[PDB]
Amino acid sequence: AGVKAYELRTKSKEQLASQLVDLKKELAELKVQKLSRPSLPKIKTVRKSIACVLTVINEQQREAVRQLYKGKKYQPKDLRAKKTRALRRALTKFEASQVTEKQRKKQIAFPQRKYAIKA
Template sequence: MRVRTAAQDTQCQGAETLYAYSLPPRSYVNPRSRKLLPSNPYSQPLQKTAQLWNKSKDELASQLADLKSELIQLRTAKVTGGSNTKLTRIHDVRKGIAKVLTVINANQRAQLRLFYKGKKYTPLDLRPKQTRAIRRRLTKHEASLVTEKQKKKQTHFPQRKYAVKA
């Protein structure tokens, strides 16, 4: 926050009144690319995703409905020639909708994983991705299986244990 005296202002020299005003930050650094990006002075801070994880399914659904209705209002304002602040808010609302949907979908998938945990089969989208070769590989149990003939050979002719006397 910058505090200036009116005497410092070029427009009204000689006055002694003190007034304060805050300026929006001109730019911020994108942490991933380390580039300086222009900040949007009109954007309102949205809810953090960390706070969304603690909400219930009903709360998330109601918040999603609110955000979608707000987006519809903003888009109508855009068509009818609304203020600049509303136009810049569209981006933030869309990102907010994406955050809420991400949390909802992640919670659904977590519930499905719990449901299919002990079952014989799991849906393809819940199975681990891995590589194609790993997915085609034999399981540990299948790889360890030995034929009857091989078992007999191993029992009758085991690995010899011997040591050299020094």
């Protein structure tokens, strides 16, 4: 009926490879049978199962690499955030909040007061 990705997340690195090989065998023999049959809609199920298995395998591989590169400078660029080239040229919040000590003394000494015209 099709593999289910949530049941794929619970498998290991070898079970998913063996199931990928099994699915590719099924696709090959179904592709032989398509020659002798006028229609065969069950090609599509095995093809989407292959896609789902490869998706789960890539999720496990990329999360393993993120756990290896976790909490340090220079992650790989595919694991860095893709926002926008200008949004990562982009002075950070720290750099945009840098203030010289003269300006910081002025900002502490004379902040914008809160006031009202009533009395």
